[PDB]
Amino acid sequence: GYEVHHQKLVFFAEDVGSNKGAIIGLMVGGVV
Amino acid sequence: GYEVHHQKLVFFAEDVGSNKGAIIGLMVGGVV
Amino acid sequence: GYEVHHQKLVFFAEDVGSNKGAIIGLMVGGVV
Amino acid sequence: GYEVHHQKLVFFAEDVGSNKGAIIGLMVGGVV
Amino acid sequence: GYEVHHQKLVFFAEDVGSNKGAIIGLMVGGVV
Amino acid sequence: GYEVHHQKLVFFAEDVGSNKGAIIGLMVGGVV
Amino acid sequence: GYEVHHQKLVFFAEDVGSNKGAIIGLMVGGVV
Amino acid sequence: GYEVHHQKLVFFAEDVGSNKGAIIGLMVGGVV
Amino acid sequence: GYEVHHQKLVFFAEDVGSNKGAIIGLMVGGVV
Amino acid sequence: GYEVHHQKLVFFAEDVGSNKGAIIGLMVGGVV
Amino acid sequence: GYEVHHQKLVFFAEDVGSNKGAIIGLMVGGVV
Amino acid sequence: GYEVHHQKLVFFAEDVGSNKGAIIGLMVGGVV
Amino acid sequence: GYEVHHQKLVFFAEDVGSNKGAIIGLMVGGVV
Amino acid sequence: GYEVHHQKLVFFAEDVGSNKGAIIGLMVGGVV
Amino acid sequence: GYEVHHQKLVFFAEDVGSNKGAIIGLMVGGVV
Amino acid sequence: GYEVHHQKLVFFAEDVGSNKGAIIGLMVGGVV
Amino acid sequence: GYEVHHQKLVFFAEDVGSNKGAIIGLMVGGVV
Amino acid sequence: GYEVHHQKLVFFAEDVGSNKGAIIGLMVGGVV
Numbered sequence: 408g409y410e411v412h413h414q415k416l417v418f419f420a421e422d423v424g425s426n427k428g429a430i431i432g433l434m435v436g437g438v439v
Numbered sequence: 440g441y442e443v444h445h446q447k448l449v450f451f452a453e454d455v456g457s458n459k460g461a462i463i464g465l466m467v468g469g470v471v
Numbered sequence: 472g473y474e475v476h477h478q479k480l481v482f483f484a485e486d487v488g489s490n491k492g493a494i495i496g497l498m499v500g501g502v503v
Numbered sequence: 504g505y506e507v508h509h510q511k512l513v514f515f516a517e518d519v520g521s522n523k524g525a526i527i528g529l530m531v532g533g534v535v
Numbered sequence: 536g537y538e539v540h541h542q543k544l545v546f547f548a549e550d551v552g553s554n555k556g557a558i559i560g561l562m563v564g565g566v567v
Numbered sequence: 568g569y570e571v572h573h574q575k576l577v578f579f580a581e582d583v584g585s586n587k588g589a590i591i592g593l594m595v596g597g598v599v
Numbered sequence: 600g601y602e603v604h605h606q607k608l609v610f611f612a613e614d615v616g617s618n619k620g621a622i623i624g625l626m627v628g629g630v631v
Numbered sequence: 632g633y634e635v636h637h638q639k640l641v642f643f644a645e646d647v648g649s650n651k652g653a654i655i656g657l658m659v660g661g662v663v
Numbered sequence: 664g665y666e667v668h669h670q671k672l673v674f675f676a677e678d679v680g681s682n683k684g685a686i687i688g689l690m691v692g693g694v695v
Numbered sequence: 696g697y698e699v700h701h702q703k704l705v706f707f708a709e710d711v712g713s714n715k716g717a718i719i720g721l722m723v724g725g726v727v
Numbered sequence: 728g729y730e731v732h733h734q735k736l737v738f739f740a741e742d743v744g745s746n747k748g749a750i751i752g753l754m755v756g757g758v759v
Numbered sequence: 760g761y762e763v764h765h766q767k768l769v770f771f772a773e774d775v776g777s778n779k780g781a782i783i784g785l786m787v788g789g790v791v
Numbered sequence: 792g793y794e795v796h797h798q799k800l801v802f803f804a805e806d807v808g809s810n811k812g813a814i815i816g817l818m819v820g821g822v823v
Numbered sequence: 824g825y826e827v828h829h830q831k832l833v834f835f836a837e838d839v840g841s842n843k844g845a846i847i848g849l850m851v852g853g854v855v
Numbered sequence: 856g857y858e859v860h861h862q863k864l865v866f867f868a869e870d871v872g873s874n875k876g877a878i879i880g881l882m883v884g885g886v887v
Numbered sequence: 888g889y890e891v892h893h894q895k896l897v898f899f900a901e902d903v904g905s906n907k908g909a910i911i912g913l914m915v916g917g918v919v
Numbered sequence: 920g921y922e923v924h925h926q927k928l929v930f931f932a933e934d935v936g937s938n939k940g941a942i943i944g945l946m947v948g949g950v951v
Numbered sequence: 952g953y954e955v956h957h958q959k960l961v962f963f964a965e966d967v968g969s970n971k972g973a974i975i976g977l978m979v980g981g982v983v
Contacts, residue, residue, distance in 0.1 A: 413539075414447075414595060415448065415543045418548075419450070419451045419548075420451075420452045423454050423553060426457060426556050427950070428556035429484035430557075431559045431560065432464045435469060436468075436470060436564045437562075437564075439471065441475070444567040446563060447479050451482070452484045452589060453485040454550070456486070457484060459487075460493075461491070462852070463495050464496045466497070468534070471476075471715075471716055476507060479510070481512070489521075494524070496529070496852050498529070498531065499531045502508075502622060524821075526820050526822060532656050533654055536570070538570045540599050541572070544574065544578075546577075546578035547578065547579050548581065551580055554950075555589030558950045561592070564595055566597060566749070567599060585954075586983060590948075590950065597784070598781065603635055604637050605671055606638070606639075606672075606755055608640050609673045610640075610675070610719060611644070611673070612677060621684070621716075622655065623687055625659075626691070627661065628694055629692065629726065631661040638727075640691060642687055644685050661814075661846075665697070666698065668700055669700065669701050670704065672703065672704045672753075672785075674751060675707045683715075683717035687721065689720075693725055694725070694846050697731065698791075701733050704735065710741060711740070713748040713749035718749070718750050718752075719752070723753060723755045731764070736768040736769065740781075741772065746781065751783045751784065756789030757942060757944075759939070759940060789942070793824045794824065797831060798829075798831060798887065800883060802832070803835045804836040806875075809845050813844050815849065822853060829951075834879070836875050836908070837871070837875060839875060840871070842875075847877070849882070860892050860951040864896050866943055868973075874939075879910070883913060883915050890922050891923045892923075892983045898931070898932065900931075900973050901932060902972045904938065905938065906938075908938040908973075913944075916949065918949065920952060924954075924955075924983060928979070932972050932973065938973065941974060948978055948979055948980050948981035
C-alpha cells in the first residue's frame with residue numbers, strides 16, 4: 408500500500424572543558 | 440490500516456566538567 | 472493514536488557531578 | 504488491533520549517577 | 536497516492552580544534 | 568499527489584579544519 | 600581433481616505458511 | 632598432501648521442523 | 664604443488680503469499 | 696608459478712515481494 | 728610469470744520501481 | 760611477461776534503470 | 792615508584808603456556 | 824606524580840606449531 | 856594536571872614452516 | 888609536562904608460503 | 920598551551936603474495 | 952606554542968614494489 412520513511416538524528420556537541428564524557432556501544436534495530 | 444516507519448536518536452554531549460558519566464554496552468533488538 | 476514499528480533512543484551526556492556514574496551491560500536475544 | 508513493535512530507551516548522564524561505580528549485567532533469551 | 540522517503544540528519548559542533556570528549560559506536564536501522 | 572525521495576543533511580562546525588573532536592561510528596538506514 | 604579449501608553458503612528462501620515472527624540468532628565457533 | 636577443511640551453512644526458510652515461527656538466540660563453544 | 668580456493672555463495676529468494684519476513688543473525692567462524 | 700583462484704557469487708531474486716523482515720546478517724570465515 | 732586470478736560475479740533479479748525489501752550483510756572470506 | 764587476471768561480472772535483471780531492489784553489503788575475498 | 796593508569800596487553804604466542812586444554816573463553820563484568 | 828594513560832599492545836608470534844589447539848577468547852566491558 | 860596519551864602497536868609475526876596455530880578473539884577496553 | 892599524543896604503528900612480519908601464520912581479532916578500547 | 924600529534928606508520932616485511940592466512944583485524948583508536 | 956600534525960606512512964619490504972604481503976584490517980587514528 409502506502410509507506411512513509413523517516414529518521415531523526417540529532418548530534419549536538421560542545422568542545423571545551425572536555426573530560427572523557429561518555430561511551431556508548433549499542434546495537435538497536437536491523438529491519439522493521 | 441496505515442503503514443509508517445520512523446527512527447529517533449538524540450545524541451547530545453556537553454563539554455562540561457562532566458566526567459565519564461557512563462559506559463553503555465547494549466544489544467537490544469527491535470526487529471520483526 | 473496510531474503508530475507503527477519505530478526506534479526511540481535518547482543518548483544525553485551533561486554536567487555529571489558524581490563519579491563514573493554507571494557501567495551497563497545488557498543483551499536481548501530474539502525480538503518479539 | 505494494530506501492534507507497534509518498538510522499545511523505549513532513555514540513556515542519560517547528569518548530576519544523578521547512581522553510585523560511585525555501579526555495574527549492571529543482564530542477559531535475556533526470547534522476547535515476547 | 537502518497538509516498539515519501541527522507542531523513543532528518545542534523546549535526547552541530549562548537550569550539551572545535553580541541554577534543555570534544557565523547558564516543559558513540561552504534562548501529563541503528565538498516566532496512567524499513 | 569507529489570512523491571519525493573531524497574535525504575535532508577545539515578551540519579555546522581565552528582573552528583573547523585582540525586579533528587572531528589568526538590567520534591561517532593554510526594550506521595543509520597540502508598534500504599527504504 | 601584435488602580438493603581445496605572453500606566456503607559454502609546456501610541461503611534459500613521460500614516462505615510457505617511461515618509468518619512474520621521467525622527469528623534465529625546463533626553463533627558457533629569451529630573450535631573454541 | 633594438504634587437508635581441505637571449511638565450514639558449510641545451509642539456511643533454508645521453508646516448512647522446516649522448528650516452531651510455527653519462534654525466536655531464538657544462542658551460541659555454542661566449539662571445543663574446550 | 665597446486666592450490667586453488669573459491670567461494671561459493673548461493674542466495675535465492677521466492678515470492679509467494681507469506682513474505683520473506685524472517686531474521687537470520689549468525690556468526691560462524693572463530694577457528695577452523 | 697601457476698595458481699587458480701576465483702569466487703563463485705550467485706545472487707538471485709524473482710518476482711520479489713520481500714517485506715516485514717527479510718534480513719541475513721552473517722559473519723562467515725575467520726579461519727579457513 | 729603467468730597467473731590465473733579472476734572473480735565470478737553472477738546477479739539475477741527483478742528491478743521494478745518498488746524496492747524488493749531485503750538486506751544481506753555478509754562477511755564471507757577473511758582467511759583461506 | 761604479463762599475468763592473466765581480470766574481473767568477470769554478469770548481471771541479468773528485469774525492468775532495470777530504476778532502483779537497486781535489495782541491498783547486498785557483502786565482503787567476498789580476504790585471502791586466497 | 793610512579794602510578795600510571797593505562798592499558799597494556801602483550802600477546803606472546805610460542806610453544807609454551809598451552810597446557811591441559813589450550814582453549815580459553817572468559818568474561819569480566821565491569822570493574823576489575 | 825602524574826598519571827600516563829595510553830594504549831599499548833604488543834602482538835608477537837613465533838612459528839612452532841604442533842599444539843593442543845591454541846584458541847583464546849576474552850571479553851571486558853566497563854572499567855579496569 | 857598534564858597527561859600524555861598515545862598509541863603503540865607492535866605487530867611481530869614469524870614464518871617458519873609450521874604455523875604457531877593461534878587465534879586471539881578479544882574485546883579489550885573497559886575505560887581506564 | 889605537556890599533553891602529547893602521537894601515533895606509533897610498527898608492523899613487522901614475514902609472509903612466506905608456509906602455514907596460516909596467525910589470526911588476531913580484537914577490539915582495542917575506545918578511551919584509554 | 921600546546922600539543923603535538925603526528926602520524927607514524929612503519930611496515931617492515933616480506934611482501935610476497937600472501938601467507939595462507941596471516942590476518943590482523945583490530946579496532947584501535949576511538950579516543951586517546 | 953604551535954600545534955603540529957601531519958601524515959607519515961613508510962612501507963618497506965624485500966621483494967619488489969610490494970604486494971599486499973599480509974592482511975592488516977586495522978583502524979588506527981580516528982580521534983586522539
